[PDB]
Structures are given as C-alpha cells and as structure tokens.
Amino acid sequence: EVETFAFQAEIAQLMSLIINTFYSNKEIFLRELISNSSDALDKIRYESLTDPSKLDSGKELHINLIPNKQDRTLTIVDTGIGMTKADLINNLGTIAKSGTKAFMEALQAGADISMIGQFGVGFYSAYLVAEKVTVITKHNDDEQYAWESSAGGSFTVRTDTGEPMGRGTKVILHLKEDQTEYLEERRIKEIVKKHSQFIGYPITLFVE
Amino acid sequence: EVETFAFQAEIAQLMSLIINTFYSNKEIFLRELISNSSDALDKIRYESLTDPSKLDSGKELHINLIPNKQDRTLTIVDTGIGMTKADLINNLGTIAKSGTKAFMEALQAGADISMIGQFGVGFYSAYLVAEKVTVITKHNDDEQYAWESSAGGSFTVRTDTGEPMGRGTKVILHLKEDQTEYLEERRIKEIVKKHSQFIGYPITLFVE
Ligand SMILES: CCCCN(C)C(=O)c1cc(-c2n[nH]c(=O)n2-c2ccccc2F)c(O)cc1O
C-alpha cells in the first residue's frame, strides 16, 4: 500500500548538503517550519473569505508544538490549508528545483545555510536535526496522506489510515540522538521568541 | 463609471501613520513591492503546473522597473497572477485588518516601520514616497481594473479601458516632489542590490 519515489536530483543533492555540512546554528529549522505553517494558514483563511464552507473541516487557525522525549520526536501541527497528493509527489518538488539551484549558487557566492527560506526550500532544514521526517496532511479536496523520508534519495507516500485530523499538516521530526535539546521547553521557547515572535497565529508549546 | 470606497478604519489609520511619521529610510518601499510581485509570480507559476492553460495570457514571469522623470512616476510591473475586483475592494482589506493591528502594536512595542512586510501590509509603504498610487491589474478570471488612492481615507476602482496588459499587476507610484531620487538609475540599482538580490525572477531596470 506504500509508494516509493525518487527525489528530484537537485533536492537529493540539497538534502545531502544539509546533512553533511558542518553548521552549528541548527535551530533555524524551527522558524522555517513555523513559517510554512503560517503560509498554509494564510491560504485557508483567504480562501474562506470567498467560500466560508472551507472551514467546515475546522474553524481554528493555529500552530501546536509538541515534544515527545519517549519517541524522541518534535511535532509541528497546523490547521492550514493542507496538501494534496499531487502537492506531495509532484508539485512541490518541481518549484523546489529552481529554488534549490538558486540556493546552492548563493552558498558558493558565500551565503549561509540560514538564508535557505528565501529560496522556498526552508522545509529541508528539518534534516539539520532530524534523521527522519514524517508528514501527515489533509486538504479539503483530497484524502489524508503520510509522506516520509529518511533522506537517502527517496521518499514514500501512502494513504493514512491512522487517526483523522480534519484539515492541515503535521510534521513529525524524528530527531537525531545528539539533537534532543529541541525537546526541552526552555530551548523551544527561546527559539520561538527569537525567530518567530511576529507570526499572526497562536503558537502553543505543549508541556510533557 | 468610477466607484469610490472608504478604507477600513485600521488601514486608513496605518496610511496616516506612514504619511505623518518622521522616518528617513524610505527606500524599503521598493523591496516590499518587489516582494509582492514575486509572490504573485509564484502563485501563477504554481497554478500553471496543474493547468498549463493559465499561461495563455502570458508565458514570461518577470518584473520591470520603469522610471519616468517627466510624469514623476516609478512603475513596478509584474506578470504574476493578478487580482480580481473582489481582491481590490474587499478581500485584501479584510486580511489587512489583522495585519495592521499586529503591526501598529509592534510599533508601540518599539518595532520600526521597516518591519511592515512581516505583517502582510508592506504595500502601504509606497506612501512613504508616493502622494498617489495607481494599480492596474488583470487576473485570468476577471477584467482589467484600475485602483487608485491618494490616502485620504478613500480609494477608487473602475474598469480600465486603457491599453490591455494580458495578466499581472502594474503599480504606478506618483512620487512626492522631494522623492525624485527614486527615479535615478544608480539609486534604484543600489536598492535592488541591497534588498532584493535573491528574488527568483528577472528584474529589469528600464533606462530613460
Ligand atoms: C513535499 C514536502 C513538503 C514539506 N512540507 C511539509 C512543507 O513545506 C509544509 C507545507 C505546509 C503546507 N500545507 N499547505 C500548504 O500550502 N503548505 C505549504 C506552505 C508553505 C510552502 C509550501 C507549502 F506547500 C505546511 O502547513 C507545513 C509545512 O511544513
């Protein structure tokens, strides 16, 4: 029931660079994921002006940060517009082809990994801290899907039979052994305050 | 043939603040407009993956900067997705209600006008340099419209009978008398290099 796909060549190369480069300031992953959540929330909010029934699958527009020391996971949940199967498999890979090329050029021109979000590919900064990422997503117009990748040049997509979520996206970061700092309450608080303080949606940091 | 509308109260108040505050670093207007053009170009590019006929109204995705010393205008043109009448009159005012409130709060909390784009209302930084703004826009699904405002709490919209443009948005900044520096080639070049160097579309600075 599980489809396996190869990444575009440029994305696979971006992911290797992110995993292999020595770069200490890994905490920027969180801002990039919160930023993408915010954009997804903007999208469903705007669509709902012209069609209030888009919020039948959920009225609240918000972001939850959920650390889990047992599973060694950090989960970022939003109730944004979600993603279709086509988004996961094809559409986002395609726009990320040019953004990756632009980004990798700038890095040669001296730029630093922290500028990744200006090229549209800030999601892949998750692999600074995660050995595996799972994405569960639900768009009004499609079914619930699980996307997963451990960054070896391939990703999987399946229909998700797990617990339904209504509308939005959940990003489950399976953290590397030496990156458990991002499960601690004061570390996450520090990072959100420093990088994400002007997001226009509630950000709730769950306690354990 | 011309409809006159009142701005939302919060936007009218944002515009007065932008016009009345002493703030020397006015050049940030250009980055905000180029940023919105880029977002509009992203939108039509993405829509065209799932429906290549959206580019029948124009294949090229680009940004032109056109100074005109005679008319004292600076025009920013893009071939992005364009805006519907509903966008101009109602939809963008509504999302800009919360962004304005958020922004004006931050300014009390010390923030500075240069952060306006983080709240979604960066367009209104045009009134740092313009006494009047005209917006001509064409969306695939609607007709060509002219929006105009001289920031006295009202704006006008009409159907544009002028020369058709295909798809996109043109922003015509009627500059204040003491802001002609933004018509000079070396000044515009300087600003684009400093603030807009990583935009993923061609930016062409027309000569006079
Ligand atoms: C193929 C792998 C994808 C990686 N992921 C999960 C993301 O980028 C990502 C995407 C969304 C998302 N839902 N709906 C939507 O439009 N977006 C979206 C937002 C911003 C840029 C692009 C987007 F598609 C989100 O809410 C959270 C995310 O972390």
Ligand SMILES: CCCCN(C)C(=O)c1cc(-c2n[nH]c(=O)n2-c2ccccc2F)c(O)cc1O
């Ligand atoms: C009511 C007054 C509006 C002010 N203007 C002209 C802008 O903000 C503005 C808007 C667009 C635009 N075309 N299509 C589209 O989606 N956008 C858009 C882009 C970014 C945020 C919001 C948007 F609607 C542009 O290409 C250039 C602009 O300067």
